[PDB]
UniProtKB/Swiss-Prot annotation:
Entire protein: shown range: 213 to 417 of 1256
Family statement drawn from the similarity comment of this UniProt entry: In the N-terminal section; belongs to the N-acetylmuramoyl-L-alanine amidase 2 family.
Task performed by this protein: Endohydrolysis of the di-N-acetylchitobiosyl unit in high-mannose glycopeptides and glycoproteins containing the -[(Man)5(GlcNAc)2]-Asn structure. One N-acetyl-D-glucosamine residue remains attached to the protein; the rest of the oligosaccharide is released intact. Cleaves the peptidoglycan connecting the daughter cells at the end of the cell division cycle, resulting in the separation of the two newly divided cells. Acts as an autolysin in penicillin-induced lysis.
Assembly, per entry: Oligomer; forms a ring structure at the cell surface which is important for efficient partitioning of daughter cells after cell division.
Post-translational changes noted in the entry: Undergoes proteolytic processing to generate the two extracellular lytic enzymes, probably at the septal region on the cell surface.
Domain remark text: The GW domains are responsible for directing the proteins to the septal region.
Protein name, entry field: Bifunctional autolysin
Subcellular location: Secreted
Length: 205
């Protein structure tokens, strides 16, 4: 059989996710007819990676975030939102979204983490981000490569886009993940494992 993934980053939260065999919900669509449908720089259907954002909002729900975004889409919109219960895709991943400024937008799928308020719901939200991201990497034939420390790859934080590409100055998701005793590198390891499970290279949970 296939080898179990050896975690490359210690994570008691990822251990919890795996041990309890958490299952991500289905990706559901909530598209909006008036959002623009613009190409990535290499074409429609040509994303180069995916960005981790968080809503920076301790009070909102995923429904409130989506309501706000549909009203303010000319200022910002993203591809999807995840929380502890749902994965909602709000724009097709084949077209760009307005989520990470003028340099990153023509390159990357943008996904927002909605804030959660207990341990189990936070863990699920991480599992859900990672499932969605691994799914996109697989579908588009991208392999996980973290850009955090070298400015190159297919998985980016908003912070990394601000640091290496410019066009924006946000610092998500580091502070938010830290507040829940997690980190971007633990998330990345979870994306990597899930990608490898989907690609049939390591054992499913
Ligand atoms: Na898609
Ligand atoms: Na890299």
């Amino acid at each position: 059989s296939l080898p179990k993934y050896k975690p490359q980053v210690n994570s008691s939260i990822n251990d919890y996710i795996c041990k309890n065999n958490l299952k991500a919900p289905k990706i559901e669509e909530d598209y909006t007819s008036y959002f623009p449908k613009y190409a990535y720089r290499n074409g429609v259907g040509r994303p180069e990676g995916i960005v981790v954002h968080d809503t920076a909002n301790d009070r909102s729900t995923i429904n409130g975030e989506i309501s706000y975004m549909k009203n303010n889409y000319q200022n910002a919109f993203v591809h999807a939102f995840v929380d502890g219960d749902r994965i909602i895709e709000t724009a097709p991943t084949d077209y760009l979204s307005w989520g990470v400024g003028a340099v990153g937008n023509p390159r990357f799928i943008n996904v927002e983490i909605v804030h959660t308020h207990d341990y189990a719901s936070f863990a699920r939200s991480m599992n859900n981000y990672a499932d969605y991201a691994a799914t996109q990497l697989q579908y588009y034939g991208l392999k996980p490569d973290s850009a955090e420390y070298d400015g190159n790859g297919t998985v980016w934080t908003h912070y990394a886009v601000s640091k290496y590409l410019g066009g924006t100055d946000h610092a998500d998701p580091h502070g938010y993940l830290r507040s829940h005793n997690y980190s971007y590198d633990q998330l990345y390891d979870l994306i990597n494992e899930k990608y490898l499970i989907k690609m049939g290279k390591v054992a499913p949970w």
